[PDB]
C-alpha cells in the first residue's frame, strides 16, 4: 500500500506513535517519507547483507527474521515479511521497541539526516487528526 501523508498520520496516531518516547507525529511521518516514500512494500538491501523492510525500513540485522542475515537477531520476534503488510500494526509495534532502545529516532538514518531539527509539523499540516 502507498499511504497518503494524512492517511499515514492517522494510522500512526491510532496505533499510539504520536509522542511515543517524546517524538511528535510529524517526526514519524517525516521518517516514513524518507525511509519508504510511504510504501509498505518497500525493501532495501544494506551493505552488510541485512535488509530494511516496510514503511519504516526496519532492518533484519536486529529486529525481524528474514532467514538470510547471518548472525542477526529478531528482537521484534516477527518475520520481516510481516513488516510489509498494508496494515502497519507490526511495523509500529516494532518501531516502539526500536525507539525505546537508547538512541531514540537516531536509529533511523534518514530521520537523523533529513528530519531531525526540521519543521516536522509540516508533515501533519492540514490533516484532520
Ligand atoms: Cl509534529
Ligand atoms: Cl537470519
Ligand atoms: Cl520468522
Ligand atoms: Cl494500518
Ligand atoms: Cl530521545
Ligand atoms: Na534477523
Ligand atoms: Pt496498535
Swiss-Prot record:
It comes from the Eukaryota. Keywords: Allergen, Antimicrobial, Bacteriolytic enzyme, Disulfide bond, Glycosidase, Hydrolase, Secreted, Signal. It is found in: Secreted. Residues 1-129 form the C-type lysozyme domain. Substrate binds at residue 101. Monomer. Lysozyme C is capable of both hydrolysis and transglycosylation; it also shows a slight esterase activity. It acts rapidly on both peptide-substituted and unsubstituted peptidoglycan, and slowly on chitin oligosaccharides. This is Lysozyme C. It comes from Gallus gallus (Chicken).
Amino acid at each position: 500500500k502507498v499511504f497518503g501523508r494524512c492517511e499515514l498520520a492517522a494510522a500512526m496516531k491510532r496505533h499510539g506513535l504520536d509522542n511515543y518516547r517524546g517524538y511528535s507525529l510529524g517526526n514519524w511521518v517525516c521518517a516514513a517519507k524518507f525511509e519508504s516514500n510511504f510504501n509498505t512494500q518497500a525493501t532495501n538491501r544494506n551493505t552488510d547483507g541485512s535488509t530494511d523492510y516496510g514503511i519504516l525500513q526496519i532492518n533484519s540485522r536486529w529486529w525481524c527474521n528474514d532467514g538470510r542475515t547471518p548472525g542477526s537477531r529478531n528482537l521484534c520476534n516477527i518475520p520481516c515479511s510481516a513488516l510489509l503488510s498494508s496494515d502497519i500494526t507490526a511495523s509500529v509495534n516494532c518501531a516502539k521497541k526500536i525507539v525505546s532502545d537508547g538512541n531514540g529516532m537516531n536509529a533511523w538514518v534518514a530521520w537523523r539526516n533529513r528530519c531531525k531539527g526540521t519543521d516536522v509539523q509540516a508533515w501533519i499540516r492540514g490533516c484532520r487528526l
